[PDB]
Write a protein that binds this ligand. Structure first.
Ligand SMILES: [Mg+2]
Ligand SMILES: [Mg+2]
Ligand SMILES: [Mg+2]
Ligand SMILES: [Mg+2]
Ligand SMILES: [Mg+2]
Ligand SMILES: [Mg+2]
Ligand SMILES: [Mg+2]
Lengths: 92, 167
RNA sequence: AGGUAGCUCAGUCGGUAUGAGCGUCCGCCUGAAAAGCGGAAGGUCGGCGGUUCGAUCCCGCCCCUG
């Protein structure tokens, strides 16, 4: 269909709103999981008589994947950096 | 085994954990590092969790041939404990050195046996309690003589690391 | 001829990785264990690249073992 404003934009604001790996885990399965609306386009992408719509449908997931990947690595960096400071000891 | 004194100072040096890594000095000369390895290094390398390591340059450790002549006083010792509150990132060794510098020659042994944090102490603080053993070389030390030496140690730690006597 | 979850192995011959065993974690069991059941976590499907709207699957090169 045309879900460039209701599926990609609805996910890029819910991904950036998550500040926890647990919150981001729920947004994953709701906006990029197997039961996601963006997944429904590929599940029915072969019952279509591809060239003019495939690159436009794949670009909907290529943009939604970047938001999850750039947020996962960011929250992973914040989590890893915080464990190191919390594990500091007096070496003397 | 090398008959040298050694100080450990905080350092950040891969592949060690930046918060659990000491750089080893003999005098003012670095001679190596020790502590726990970095968690990212451990995972990428397939190492056991919590692996620790030490590496020293033996050729940087100077050779020592000491000829000790220890002072062995037979007179009784006075035992006192001091509880000092400092900021949480003040190394315990710096507090002990300040206590030792103020106590003078009467101080025979100092040993840290308690590091405490909590609401009784305050945020960003910690409490260190040292066991002090005083002894005179020519007389039985009195409680007042030892307390005067203890008070001078407390004053030294106050000026050097900002220690506050625990109340 | 094959390379598939941390390891050991089936499957999928262009558009939701179908799965097991061990291992790991987690509950039952034990004062605590082992063993056992029970369930969960766990898969750019060898690198480098093409082809394609889209590659674990097809094409080129190379690592790997018999
Ligand atoms: Mg006493
Ligand atoms: Mg007494
Ligand atoms: Mg077959
Ligand atoms: Mg399975
Ligand atoms: Mg399964
Ligand atoms: Mg479990
Ligand atoms: Mg994995």
């Amino acid at each position: 269909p045309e879900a460039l404003t209701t599926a990609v934009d609805a996910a890029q604001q819910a991904i950036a709103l998550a500040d926890t790996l647990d919150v981001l885990a729920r947004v994953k399965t709701e906006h990029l999981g197997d039961r996601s609306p963006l997944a429904l386009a590929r599940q029915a992408l072969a019952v279509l008589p591809r060239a003019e719509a495939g690159k436009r449908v794949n670009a909907a997931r290529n943009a939604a994947q970047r938001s999850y990947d750039e947020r996962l690595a960011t929250l992973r960096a914040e989590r890893d950096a915080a464990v190191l400071v919390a594990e500091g000891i007096d070496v003397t | 085994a090398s008959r040298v004194d050694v100080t450990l100072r905080p350092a950040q040096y891969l592949p060690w954990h930046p918060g659990r890594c000491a750089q080893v000095f003999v005098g003012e000369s670095s001679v190596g590092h020790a502590g726990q390895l970095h968690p990212a290094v451990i995972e990428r390398s397939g190492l056991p969790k919590g692996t620790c390591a030490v590496e020293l340059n033996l050729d940087a450790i100077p050779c020592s041939a000491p000829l000790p002549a220890p002072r062995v006083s037979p007179y009784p010792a006075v035992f006192q404990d001091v509880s000092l509150v400092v900021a949480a990132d003040i190394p315990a060794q710096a507090v002990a050195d300040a206590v030792r510098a103020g106590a003078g020659d009467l101080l025979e042994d100092i040993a840290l046996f308690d590091v405490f944090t909590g609401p009784q102490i305050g945020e960003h603080r910690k409490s260190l309690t040292f066991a002090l053993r005083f002894r005179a070389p020519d007389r039985t030390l009195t409680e007042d003589d030892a307390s005067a030496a203890r008070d001078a140690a407390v004053q030294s730690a106050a000026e050097r690391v900002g220690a506050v006597l625990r109340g």
